[model samples]
Target: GVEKTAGETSATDTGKREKQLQQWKNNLKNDVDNTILSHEQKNEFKTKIDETNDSDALLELENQFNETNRLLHIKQHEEVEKDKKAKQQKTLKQSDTKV
Candidate 1:
């Protein structure tokens, strides 16, 4: 099935996808700019960035990044909720204990 974004098709044609993916990788490399951690991240993301590598690997990394970003967002939200709940619960417990 074609992935739709808004009213537009999200899935590019195979050739276009390859081109776009290469551009993305190039952008990533440019952003890295030869720093130490940049080199490390580049190595870690090498399989994804390598032009000779499989498209599936790039797609896999993209999917993984999406899911990881979503989870991190949700986890941060939950952590705030948990902290608020704990603070409320502690206050309630203290009030109850005083009664």
Candidate 2:
């Protein structure tokens, strides 16, 4: 049994959701333009930008893009230290071979 006597219910606003999603996508595209990512990487975002209709999904996609932008490396200290360790291991192997 259902007794319905309420004012016009207006909850599902599709237009607003669509417009907000489009705006979010545009802002993400702008962010992509301001980065040093490769052309392929930038285009990858463009291709996937419009694939989501939900704000949460679009946010996750943009979050991944931002994380990817943090991969710019400037320090070679790790490389140098790893090479030193490798050389020590090789010298140890050579001495063992002569025994």
Candidate 3:
């Protein structure tokens, strides 16, 4: 009876886990395909997906790609701000030199 109970529990847990996994996989795939990554980012991620040998490795690659993309966005924003500030400074310097 104990062995039978354990087997039933394992089966139930496996089914539950599988359902959750499928849901997560679908969400991840959607996010990867739909997000605003550049062509280079898409190609890089596609390469990683192709190279992945298991679900765990694929998840790791997804996380890595997401993080890198996040950083790229942050860097782009910073660069834009820097350029704006530099233009402002250049205008100030020009005004000072003219005085």
Candidate 4:
């Protein structure tokens, strides 16, 4: 079974997911650029962002990261801006995508 975590969209493009995850990491450098994540939610943002560096992983889905709110016992609305929020889920088996 794929370990999916919720998203409004889904895709199998390895490069796309790679870039999206990478871009999110880059934007995280600037604290003010957290339009999607609030100040309070920044901790979750950093936590998830911190995982992007895993050398064994090839993809990072935004929706999967958002679930950190629920995982952390925080309201979804607390971490993500209301309208900007996109429910993203990740489902995968052992090493599904290529590097």
Top candidate by lDDT: 2
Q: On a 0 to 1 TM-score scale, where does candidate 1 land against the true structure?
A: 0.42
Tens digit of lDDT per residue, candidate 4, span 1-99? 556746655764566566666765666534423444556666655665756654243234345444543464456544443334323434223332322
Give per-model TM-scores: 0.42, 0.55, 0.49, 0.26
Off by over 4 Å in 1: 1-21, 27-47, 50-52, 89-99
Candidate 2 matches the true fold with a TM-score of: 0.55
Ranking by TM-score: 2, 3, 1, 4
Models ranked on lDDT: 2, 3, 1, 4
Error of 1 at 79 (Å): 0.6
- Which runs in model 4 stand beyond 4 Å of their true positions? 1-24, 28-33, 54-61, 64-99
Whichever of 1 and 3 has more TM-score, that candidate is 3
Question: All predictions: root-mean-square deviation over Cα?
Answer: 12.8, 10.3, 9.2, 21.6
lDDT value for candidate 2?
Answer: 0.70
| Overall lDDT per candidate, in order of appearance | 0.56, 0.70, 0.64, 0.50
Write one digit per residue (lDDT tens) for candidate 2, span 1-99.
Answer: 545748876657677778878888899988876766678888888778877776777788778777777652223445545554455665432222321
Candidate 3 regions off by >4 Å?
1-30, 51-53, 89-99
| Model 1: worst 10 consecutive residues (lDDT sum) | 90-99
Which of the two, 1 or 2, has more lDDT? 2
Tens digits of lDDT, candidate 3, 32-88: 667667777776676666544457977897787688778878888787666555656
Which candidate achieves the best TM-score against the true structure? 2
In model 2, the clashing pairs are none
